[PDB]
Write a protein that binds this ligand. Structure first.
Ligand SMILES: Cn1c2c(c3ccccc31)C[C@@H]1C[C@H]2[C@H](O)CN1
Length: 282
């Protein structure tokens, strides 16, 4: 079926939970043996969210190459994404090592450091120009260059330096600051405006490594971001945009990381975002 009328048909019939449970039943199951090794317990935020072995990002290190991060490679859309958990106190150096090694231009953050009165990720970037951060375990230096605070999101320019080679690179930090502590946004308008700002920066384009996108577990809000981006790109590429099937795209993405889209409300929100976004594109 088309999307917008399939949407109204699920609303009128109140069957979002049944649609979402079908997706959960059909989703891929692949091994995640490296994630579960005892030496990696303090590298995982949640015991039930792990990268598959076949798609995990490897650190260029011979001691321990493990990080909780996955490469989502969308062949028809010609887009790739790295989805990862919010960094932990003992993985902030690994996080920036990955950004460096994978040649990423942009980092997309969809959570606040504290939500619901608890810490959802480490403070992993500097908040003042004159107070830079040094990660001694991976030999990197990170400096805040500029910050632009808007009503729904903040954009930061960062300088990442590999202290071993003295090479430097400019990284863009895109921080969506207004996702509610509970539920999903009422309107997709600010989320779509944010997606378009990331696109306009070059951070999603083939001349760079994959964008790094995270929330707390790296599957819920993060899944919504890449699902909406890929569906909108396919609607622009194909002769028949009504052939784009959001459930089929989501199942394709779940071949590369488990659990993408965590609730039926996030699934409905993803439909809404793609529907409204397709009208603005034209
Ligand atoms: C524009 N730019 C540059 C750097 C940089 C670091 C942070 C923000 C912006 C930056 C470092 C050097 C020179 C230039 C170049 O673009 C890259 N290499």
């Amino acid at each position: 079926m088309e999307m917008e009328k399939e949407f109204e048909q699920i609303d009128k019939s109140g069957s979002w939970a049944a649609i979402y449970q079908d997706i959960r039943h059909e989703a891929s199951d692949f091994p995640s043996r490296v994630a579960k090794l005892p030496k990696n317990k303090n590298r995982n935020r949640y015991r039930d969210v792990s990268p598959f072995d076949h798609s995990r990002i490897k650190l260029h290190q011979e001691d321990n190459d493990y990080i909780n991060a996955s490469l989502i490679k969308m062949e028809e859309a010609q887009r790739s994404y790295i989805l990862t958990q919010g960094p932990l106190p003992n993985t902030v150096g690994h996080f920036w090592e990955m950004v460096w090694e994978q040649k990423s231009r942009g980092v997309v953050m969809l959570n606040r450091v504290m939500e619901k009165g608890s810490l959802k990720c480490a403070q992993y970037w500097p908040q003042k120009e004159e107070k830079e951060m040094i990660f001694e375990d991976t030999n990197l230096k990170l400096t805040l260059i500029s910050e632009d605070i808007k009503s729904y999101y903040t954009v930061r320019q960062l300088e990442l330096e590999n202290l071993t080679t003295q090479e430097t690179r400019e990284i863009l930090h895109f921080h969506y600051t207004t996702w509610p502590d509970f539920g999903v946004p009422e309107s997709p308008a600010s989320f779509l405006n944010f997606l378009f700002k990331v696109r306009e920066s070059g951070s999603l384009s083939p001349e760079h490594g994959p964008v790094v996108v995270h929330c707390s577990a790296g599957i819920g809000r993060s899944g919504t971001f890449c699902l909406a981006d890929t569906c909108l790109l396919l609607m622009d590429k194909r002769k028949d945009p009504s052939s784009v099937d959001i459930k089929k795209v989501l199942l394709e993405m779940r071949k590369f990381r488990m659990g993408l889209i965590q609730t039926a409300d996030q699934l409905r929100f993803s439909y809404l975002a793609v529907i409204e976004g397709a009208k603005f594109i034209m």
